[PDB]
Design a protein around this ligand. Structure first.
Ligand SMILES: CC(=O)N[C@H]1[C@H]([C@H](O)[C@H](O)CO)O[C@@](O)(C(=O)O)C[C@@H]1O
Ligand SMILES: CC(=O)N[C@H]1[C@H]([C@H](O)[C@H](O)CO)O[C@@](O)(C(=O)O)C[C@@H]1O
Ligand SMILES: CC(=O)N[C@H]1[C@H]([C@H](O)[C@H](O)CO)O[C@@](O)(C(=O)O)C[C@@H]1O
Ligand SMILES: *[C@@H]1O[C@H](CO)[C@@H](O)[C@H](O)[C@H]1NC(C)=O
Ligand SMILES: *[C@@H]1O[C@H](CO)[C@@H](O)[C@H](O)[C@H]1NC(C)=O
Ligand SMILES: *[C@@H]1O[C@H](CO)[C@@H](O)[C@H](O)[C@H]1NC(C)=O
Ligand SMILES: *[C@@H]1O[C@H](CO)[C@@H](O)[C@H](O)[C@H]1NC(C)=O
Ligand SMILES: *[C@@H]1O[C@H](CO)[C@@H](O)[C@H](O)[C@H]1NC(C)=O
Ligand SMILES: *[C@@H]1O[C@H](CO)[C@@H](O)[C@H](O)[C@H]1NC(C)=O
Lengths: 321, 158, 321, 158, 158, 321
């Protein structure tokens, strides 16, 4: 007669690492690293992302005519942008403080587009002629839909003095521009006046832009250059425009209705018709693991990102042959 | 392992003990079988469950990357931003891999310890009344039926 | 006859956490996290802070007339500034490279204010008239005490050519400004000349400021704008001013006597009449704990900040019922 | 605990031993009482004192936050600065919380170990000359007065 | 140490055992000498070798500093860059110093454990047939020549 | 008859630390921290560094006449620059976006210098006269060898309109400058025209530089100022220069042949005639230790830098007296 003390073995094949020994087979284990995703872009808690497709954030906000899908966009959860969007800045140029603007957007979920200066508000200047073939809409010469390229009327550019007051509770993103012609002839041709300026004033902004007229490389068959500026107009503040030519003028501006947690994620993926609690640029995650190794840049209720290939905890004991 | 019981003086585990993590095998005239020791098994279950929860909790405040863009003439700050985000992800990856490695070893040893403590508990009861075989087993000097056997298991003997 | 081995228990209620078990009662323990502070701003090793109160760093250095408490300040240990100081920049504007200046200050403990260009040094221009009602002192129109708002004399603004040499061993902080009027009439009214410039030269500085004259929102009943610039004039170097109007000119400058470890801390607290070895924005710390969880931004001999609610080490053993 | 003595085969501590951390209780015709074992207590005191000092030292070079300001159009760098300062404070908070957690468990086990080693030291002396009771106690076969008792305590016997 | 054997019940090491880390000394009519126990020594060698390799590997992805320059009016970002690079070098220095400290203690205890397990393996064989001396030694009751001695060493006895 | 269990001791003096005990003597140990270096600058895998000596990166690229050792430099592995190079910018000035340029260099191993605009290409302007005594070569007034200081010919400065096309596959670093005279007389003297501009155009660059003419401190006996600009000209793009004076013009430009991992290290050391796999600013490292405590800024197959004085692992056991 005999009594013995002993411990459990089973048919487990599960392995864990230690400091002194790799691949110990254990009776029980708990994997804590999520290695799988669904490979799609999905809604975040019901709320669909803004998927730009072939349009850049610049192309969207300025209203590139190739970006009409985004004339009026609903509240989003995050924004998706391709690494190199083709439809950006159809007329060549720069977008001043572009990355600081993008940064504001990562903390915004909704815009509401409102008209601030009506196109049929210009009596002394030609609005309807500021169009290029580099910005085509339906086979015809067109232009950024939210700004108005003002040209001389009956060979005259009177000094513009226009002003907008913010009678919205909300903050308002205002965008304008300046055209840099490539020679003295073009300046005469479009604006009449040789020496011009655009001056912008708010309670915190003291701007005076002057056209830089020089010969430069053609970009998409164009030597001219557009340079776009922006400001956030506080509620109850007024923006004061004054220019005698080269002025690309506000028509539409954006009301910042909702501030929400958001990002601009870089992804070549298109919409996947799914819902998720956790989105990466490569696919969505559904799991109750503490960690995952999909991608660092997530949004939602997400596991923590590690660079591991494997994270497995022992729970049971060393399993015997 | 540190405590010398698991895959040490007790050569291997028991497929036939489906019942719990540690227990007894007995063998006499009436028959033989396995019985899990539920107290130390449950104690083991609680410890490992809390460890997993402690590990998960302690890690709920790791670094989260934020998307952040820079123009062509901000390369110094872009790179700074890169090496900063990667730097943290490396610190946390190391933190996580090592915590798992060190704790995995602690867990294996804990099981060993529990097996040794249970072995010793029985050894301290039996004393002279049985031959310690060297292999996890005790051979009785005077016949020991099921109720005597039950008696060792619950911690009453003699 | 019996001998037994055993261990200590006592009446301790002290608890420590482990990986496998929370709230283990131990016979002895050592708490290592300081959770307490005295809630006051105090001197640091005898040396009183500079407590700005309602004045901002700009308001102090330019010498806003509401900031007279700080005409001449003794060596400090750190500086305290409120989150939104009311007395900053009484005449609306900007302070150029303001945060890089603030950054220099965090490594400075003492200024000594010296006169570089005397107000009664201007023969050809009117000094005593450059004053606004937006900068009041004792019910009267006043102005930043350290800079001189120069106006035309007998309807003339001759070109100014003034120069200062640094015959101090020390570095010297020099401050100047420019006025941006809101129309052509004001330019004529104050400076006579339509088209002006301020030009500043040192051995490393090549500056030319030009007034940006545009219509903009009233701020504290003002449409004009002041824009202040600064440089650190090295010892034995000379600053060369040259302007034909809009020049807000140095009267006083600051000698940087002492460089010491310091910070500008943000705090709404006022002076507490205490001494301490360790100051946080919320109160001072006196302890020999290794850690504390008061606030990240301390100055002095301080424990290390952690975000914990509790850090307790076991020293004794598991205490029994 | 790992070593099976504290709140294991020795069921509970001694309120009556005010004297040190580990020791003996004895009981005979002349009376009974407690005596701390000073060597292992002091050894225990040194280890724990060095651990605390090691822990404090190793942490004297944590990250210190520096105040740092940014204007309205430097939001990317302000945020970078924020996430950098918070990132380190999180790394150090985790470092500190885990070091305490892991070391607290090491300290408890160390005490257990010391109790077991002291138990075994006495067991190895007594050998046959006493019945090992199973509970931390040894019952002598031949009468053992105070000087005999003192004899076990100092490590001389027979 | 935790397991009570090294510099505990076995008072000191053996200069005369050049052969391995743990082993036996024997002494009888024919003579006396040392013999390394190769199985547990090799087991010890493998564990420590893997630990060193694990430690080195886990650290191969530390933070690398990059040279980075800034002009006179970029002092905020220069300082940010400084405190960021130093911050990581401090995290890694602490990581490395503590891993070594904690693991050094684990290694010492592992050796102790191995010595105790080997002691117990022999104790479980000898049983009654020898007096346990209290010092790492077993004194035989019936004469034990070299082949009997070899018999304890390989794990066959009686 | 007696058998005993025991363990090894030897004559080891090697010590390791633990949490509970410092200086434990162990039978065996493994030191893992490299504390030694050879104190020289060496080649990295056969490939010699670019050792600037007394020349700064600016002095090298612009071709300061004191930097002739670097007229044509072979592929390097890293670049070495002293903390305060004496031969930088012989004619006083600034180098625009200098640190962003230095940053490009840390990812470049080879330049090949090619002539873009030949000096004997200027028919209407005097090239050979743009020289200063502050930039001497062999006792004579000289100038940056890679840029041409153009002066008026027969009292005239015709508008320059010059253009370069990149018919190299490679990227091309192009450098130019502008001269800021210290008075109206010097402007007349050198360039004839009072009011000048330099305008630079590529497909992404829209530049117009205007001379800032003011009185300022002499630096190395000079009141004038040079300000140098740069761009990376993409392959198949053209740079368009246009100026009527103050133009410091491209003669030579750099072809970016090879992109390699590199750094600019700061070191006062000179060449050591050695080879190494791992270089620090203080000396080279040859070891198979995982860590080292030499210097943070290394290049090559390097151990990881820690701030420790000592890192020693136990392998053997506690060694007895
Ligand atoms: C407003 C205007 O006159 N637009 C005309 C432009 C401009 O001449 C240049 O774009 C000026 O830079 O040239 C074209 C074009 O690009 O399609 C036709 C277009 O009608
Ligand atoms: C120097 C000067 O003429 N100051 C006068 C100003 C100016 O007209 C405007 O501030 C110019 O911007 O207006 C008022 C005021 O603000 O109190 C009265 C003051 O005497
Ligand atoms: C191109 C030219 O005329 N260079 C002459 C300069 C210039 O007068 C000033 O440097 C202008 O700033 O002065 C001198 C000199 O510095 O050696 C002699 C030199 O021949
Ligand atoms: C064990 O493994 C075998 C084969 O993989 C499988 O049939 C069985 O379901 C597993 N679990 C049990 C209870 O045996
Ligand atoms: C451990 O097992 C895995 C199988 O998943 C194998 O790839 C790996 O090489 C093994 N590692 C060692 C060191 O045995
Ligand atoms: C223990 O606790 C009791 C009650 O809290 C208290 O009276 C006593 O002073 C404490 N210390 C001692 C020595 O008992
Ligand atoms: C531990 O005790 C504290 C009392 O301070 C209590 O708040 C906490 O919930 C307890 N935690 C657990 C898990 O028992
Ligand atoms: C041990 O130390 C002694 C003296 O340092 C030395 O002679 C010997 O070579 C070392 N190694 C051995 C094998 O004793
Ligand atoms: C450990 O020994 C070293 C000798 O290298 C000595 O400098 C140090 O002070 C010692 N530390 C302690 C605490 O004993």
């Amino acid at each position: 007669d005999q009594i013995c003390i002993g411990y459990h073995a089973n048919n487990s094949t599960e392995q864990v690492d230690t400091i002194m020994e790799k691949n110990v087979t254990v009776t029980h284990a708990q994997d804590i690293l999520e290695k799988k995703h669904n490979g799609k872009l999905c809604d975040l808690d019901g709320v669909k992302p803004l998927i730009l497709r072939d349009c850049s954030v610049a192309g969207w906000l300025l209203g590139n005519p190739m970006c009409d899908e985004f004339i009026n966009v609903p509240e989003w959860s995050y924004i998706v942008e391709k690494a190199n969007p083709v439809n950006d800045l159809c007329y060549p140029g720069d977008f001043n403080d572009y990355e600081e603007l993008k940064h504001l957007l990562s903390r915004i979920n909704h815009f509401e587009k409102i008209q601030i200066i009506p196109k049929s508000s210009w009596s002394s200047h030609e609005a309807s002629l500021g169009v290029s073939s580099v910005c085509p809409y339906q086979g015809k010469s067109s232009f950024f839909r939210n700004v108005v390229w003002l040209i001389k009327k009956n060979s005259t550019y009177p000094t513009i003095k226009r002003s907008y007051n913010n009678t919205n509770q909300e903050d308002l993103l205002v965008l304008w521009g300046i055209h840099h012609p490539n020679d003295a002839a073009e300046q005469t041709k479009l604006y009449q006046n040789p020496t011009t300026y655009i001056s912008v004033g708010t309670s915190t902004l003291n701007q005076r832009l002057v056209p830089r007229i020089a010969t430069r490389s053609k970009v998409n068959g164009q030597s001219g250059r557009m340079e776009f500026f922006w400001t956030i107009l506080k509620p109850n503040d007024a923006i004061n425009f004054e220019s005698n030519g080269n002025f690309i003028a506000p028509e539409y501006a954006y009301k910042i209705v909702k501030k929400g947690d958001s990002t601009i994620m870089k992804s070549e993926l298109e919409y996947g018709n799914c819902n998720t609690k956790c989105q990466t640029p490569m696919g969505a995650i559904n799991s109750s693991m503490p960690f995952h190794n999909i991608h660092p840049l997530t949004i939602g209720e997400c596991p923590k990102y590690v660079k591991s290939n494997r994270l497995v905890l022992a729970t049971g004991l060393r399993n015997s042959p | 392992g540190l405590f010398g019981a698991i895959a040490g003086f007790i050569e291997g585990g028991w497929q036939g003990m489906v019942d719990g993590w540690y227990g007894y095998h007995h063998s006499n005239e009436q028959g033989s079988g396995y019985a899990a020791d539920k107290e130390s098994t449950q104690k083991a279950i609680d410890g490992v469950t809390n460890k997993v929860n402690s590990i998960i909790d302690k890690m709920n405040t790791q670094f989260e990357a934020v998307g952040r863009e820079f123009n062509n003439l901000e390369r110094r700050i872009e790179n700074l931003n890169k090496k900063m985000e990667d730097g943290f992800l490396d610190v946390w990856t190391y933190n996580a891999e090592l915590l798992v490695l060190m704790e995995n070893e602690r867990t294996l040893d804990f099981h060993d310890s529990n097996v040794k403590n249970l072995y010793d508990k029985v050894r301290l009861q039996l004393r002279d009344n049985a031959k310690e075989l060297g292999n996890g087993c005790f051979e009785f000097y005077h016949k020991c039926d099921n109720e005597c056997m039950e008696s060792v298991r619950n911690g009453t003997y003699d």
